[PDB]
């Protein structure tokens, strides 16, 4: 009957799920791929614009990792 | 004497320990490389100041640090603002990294064994000019040869200034002082008066009369009126004695030491309370340092704080000092009166009030011997009082002391609980108040009372993790004193999350001390916490006198009440205050868990009301997340599961986030939410599944925890199981189950990923195929129109520069993949059974012996085996020994990059009889797969698709032997159809049950009868023809009623009859949810019907057009929109160019309302760009449409203010996602050529 959770651990999962969602990104070229690009541009555009927020916040998530690691050397 | 170079060092030796709690120490030295890079750039300089200044240098010193300012003090180290640096003045040395195991003196004494206590004689503290003068200048009798003149004595100054070499011997000679040679002492021969301890800039003509008012030499020259001018300066306004030794002896005897009920192991504890002096008549807060505060003592004074905050302790130092030889302030008085007694106050009183401290030995003591003697001398009088108001009637303190100073003008420090100030402040001088407790004195304390057992080491690491959740935890050292019990388990604790353990102790502390009658206590705790109830309600901490009625405590104000709440000095009289945000947050849980005590029933309805204000899942994981732990902490068996019911009830099903953020400004009390929430939200934004998947963990985390208060058996079991159903999670939950025990858990799915690498391929560059579009030229208008734009590089770096931050955290981790006990506490039982293990992989970077030999056993006890892969094309044969158990993977295999060739000889040799296969890219081989493919295969649907590559027919001129259970298939015509392809596909389908077809580009060519004549009962239909037939399409294609979806595009060809033939049969056969409309032939005329009767569809989503707008199409939508029948539709789009015209979007936006059934609408692909008024009409878009996640419009190019029109009227409906107004623009010139015109 002892509570167990770790915040220093919490971030790891958060790191994990980011790279998992660079994966869900999907795109399909074509022999035409121009008319496709028409559609696909947005598709990528959204995906990209979507992703940037993910990977951006991914850092924002890990942004707090680095100092605590370093600052302990100073403690 | 300065020095140079000699890069210093910090200990590598023991630091291998910390590498456990942190990641890797080997990267520490790299940080310390900055130090020599920094130090050299600093002035190595030389002597500056004697220590007593240095405390001021630490005014801005960051409080959170390990070492104590007063540790640096005796080191005399100056505090420089650059980084944290502190500076040896006698030595040269300068330090950054602090050590818990090591006092500063060491580091100074170790590293530069030269000038400091080796008595090169730099500096002095506790400085007086009495022990410089009063006693000393006595012996200075004959201390020199005869001097009547200042020149011959000036000569003596030859020796004086190694300390200084700053203040001129002249000016002192100009004041006529003599250097005797002992230390730096200088003396005025006439008055015989001396001084020392010279701050640069000290005038004697300043100093002299202050310390020697009656000096004749002075008074014979400088005249008079000058003095009261000069007299203005910093320091304070300036058995008869045998009774004092008693006073001395009293404190000299042991009374105060061993005040902590633990033990007095260190009886004198030097860690000191940070005092602030606030000004009465204007706001200035004037931070101070204690030794300074000493000399600041003039007459009456404040000494303000709350409770257990150091009230008595601080004064107590004075005496135990005042007796002993120490810092100046003491050395002036021959009397100190310490009485903390409120008990005396009712009394008419006596000198015997003091006899409390006397312990008898009195009786000549009399108003005679006191009162007029107390005014005999004015100044050596001193009192120390714990008391307030002045209400107690005493000729002594009341009728005399605080009332009339200018009869007395004597000094007092008054311990005052904060709530007692605002009655007697007007008599009271400028403030002496306590900011809070410096986090270091704690760490100072925690040093002493412990053997430093790497309990404190384990502390800060938390208080690095938590920040606001940490650095504000300590306010009263009493909280430390609560910890100071320090047996609690064996100690403070060896246990993680030291927040509760603090609080958890602190309560049951106050029990003990105050448990004589604890009935009022709990009652107070109970009735006040109803305020803490409002913690969940909102953050409003004002707590006026009124809402206290809901708490009911009010002015009843038992001394107990203070231990929670306080007041605040007013700008305007009605006001109030409370202790601290975190302590409050924990009060709530306790008060909360008073409710949900099942033996209380009528009232627990309250909590039942509260806990239902948690309604979002994101309130659970962030907002009150840290709070709920306080609840689980206090651990009342009956409550917890009843709570758990609510929480596990929360997800419902298929409602992702009812409200992504209901967040208040309560969040500020914890920062991480802002990060997490977005991270959460963002995560949700890419993958609706994984969001709910992720969120499911922390709930289950939270869930299981409350169960592990006491009893998971009865009330816990049923709730969880419901939650578990149909879910998909990640293997971290396994070890995360303590719950691993009860059952091999079912009714769910599980995911796993391995990705270590950065991306490698050309798949993005197809913008190169957008180059022929003259992308150089188009950009023209909008002084802003830049702001609309990005370039690949510009974005490329943005992304990569951020991965670089990961890259740091990548290396220092000596860390790879899951399963500590995660597989083992998983596999601790033998008969584990796992239904589905989902595996996404990217690169071989995790290919390794043990790491996979770990994953070797993962596959065991997991009944189905799935895969999706990108980066690695070769990871298969890396697996084989892991799967040489032939564990029957089956399920499906997703692939992007290459098949490794002789790899799938494995997938051959596997022979699990897979259900399905997914390969959408690169190339494939039969000697990869399609050789003898069917034999053990034939189960469920496949995808094999390539870009331009031929030989998709040669895929299976082996398949006709096979007799398939597939019934579901996906593949294209990789040419303008070759009868082979048909001949390939033909025989198949009549012999199979024909479900869910997918074809990328069917070249319709000839005899799609031989394709679609057999077509029956499909849902999936993906064909998009470049060349048509329009026999099947018009005839048999819409002869099969039940269909959810259609994927169709690629140039509907112009027989408007055929369009009708479609349109009619489209309208005639309508079962559909959704579709892809074929791309127009000029359809536009009749595409009204492709709207008009689309009201008939029983279900709606995914409305799709690449064509057909400019005509009435809009109200044709809007009619069908305003009138019902497109209700519950999920989507809208158009990709057009021609059919794009501004003119009607407003008309399209004329009335778009009354469909809050929708998600996204996209208007896009302008080579030209589209910027006009109808951005006006946007002000009504999101507002009246209610529910939308998001939009995509790439035409907008909007005025930023009109984008302020966007961004401002965006969020009125929601907190969450938005329209995407900018693409990643292929890198191009962005010309202003029209701007040439203005
Ligand atoms: N620098 C310190 N080092 C060690 N212990 C301290 C320090 N400062 C305060 N404490 C502890 O905190 C407590 C401060 O309470 P104190 O007795 O000063 O207040 P009080 O006059 O009794 O009124 P109240 O107790 O309501 O504050 C003391 O009991 C002392 O043990």
Author numbering:
A (entry chain C): 421 to 495
B (entry chain A): 10 to 247, 404 to 1403
From the paper:
The nucleotide-binding domain (NBD)- and leucine-rich repeat (LRR)-containing (NLR) proteins are a family of intracellular receptors that play an important role in regulation of innate immune response. Neuronal apoptosis inhibitory protein (NAIP)-NLR containing a caspase activating and recruitment domain (CARD) 4 (NLRC4) complexes are ones of the most fully characterized NLR-containing inflammasomes. Ligand recognition results in NAIP interaction with NLRC4 and consequent NLRC4 activation.
After 3D classification, a subset of 1 663 317 particles was used for image reconstruction, generating a map with a global resolution of 4.28 Å, as determined with a gold standard Fourier shell correlation (FSC). Located between NBD and HD1, clear electron density that is not from NAIP5 likely defines an ATP molecule. FliC-C forms extensive interactions with NAIP5 via packing against NTD, BIR1, HD1, HD2, ID and LRR of NAIP5, supporting the observation that the C-terminal 35 resides of flagellin are necessary and sufficient for NAIP5 activation. The extreme C-terminal side of FliC-C binds to a deep hydrophobic pocket formed by NTD, BIR1 and HD1. The central region of FliC-C is sandwiched between ID and one helix from HD2 of NAIP5 mainly via van der Waals and hydrophobic contacts. In the structure, the arginine residue of FliC_D0L binds to a pocket of NAIP5 with a limited size and tightly packs against residues 106-109 from BIR1.
